[PDB]
């Protein structure tokens, strides 16, 4: 879908409730521990990125422990974890990767500091 590139960003620090409850808003950042693994790497398309983003998320012993066994299996193959029934909208039932600065204005497709994880209800809302 998109064009290749190298992931960049510092990521942000998160606790052991990364997605569940947030200390800030209804949007969760790219764990700095994760950003450190995808930094300076090229991905054929942003989907290739999200695919690997979730993979690493399942390799981290601290964040994975916060997901069920089923949600863990999903991320291991590169799929976004399922949300809770109350955060689902339509057929979208998985966590989504949003872009702070549209690929339009200043792009920044792999700018890990430009990407935040959100729920459909939210993404659809913040649109």
């Amino acid at each position: 879908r998109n064009k290749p590139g190298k992931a960049t960003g510092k990521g942000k620090p998160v606790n052991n409730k990364w997605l569940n409850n947030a200390g800030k808003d209804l949007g969760s950042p790219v764990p700095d521990r994760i950003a450190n693994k995808l930094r300076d790497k090229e991905f054929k398309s942003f989907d290739d990125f999200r695919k690997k983003f979730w993979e690493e998320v399942s390799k981290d012993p601290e964040l994975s422990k916060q997901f069920s066994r089923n949600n863990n299996d999903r991320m291991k193959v590169g799929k976004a974890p399922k949300t809770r029934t109350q955060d689902v909208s339509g057929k979208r039932t998985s966590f989504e990767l949003h872009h702070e600065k549209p690929i339009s204005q200043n792009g920044g497709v792999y700018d890990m500091d430009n990407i935040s994880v959100v729920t459909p209800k939210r993404h659809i809302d913040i649109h």
């Binding site: 069920s68 089923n70 949600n71 299996d73 193959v77 399922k82 029934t85």
Partner: protein
């Protein structure tokens, strides 16, 4: 597969089989078949938690197909709803 339209057509061993099918479709390339079985599990169990029973298990039970079955039995019996087939 052999999808029954009621929880009482399912024996416990059979419902546990449907949970492994879901787990299997859980790691497949797409969520096409998985999302279909999940809508069925949701409709035959009638639990208000929905898919959460699979992806967001209650800390008061095991995160396993047995733990899932238990919660459905308990909630169904406690609400006066027919259970799993006997045979």
């Amino acid at each position: 597969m052999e999808l029954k339209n009621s929880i009482s057509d399912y024996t416990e061993a059979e419902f546990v089989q449907l949970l492994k099918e879901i787990e299997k479709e859980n790691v497949a390339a797409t969520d096409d078949v998985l999302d279909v079985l999940l809508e069925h599990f949701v409709k035959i169990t009638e639990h208000p938690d929905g898919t959460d029973l699979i992806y967001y298990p209650s800390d008061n039970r095991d995160d396993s197909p047995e733990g899932i079955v238990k919660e459905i039995k308990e909630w169904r019996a406690a609400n006066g709803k027919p259970g799993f087939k006997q045979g």
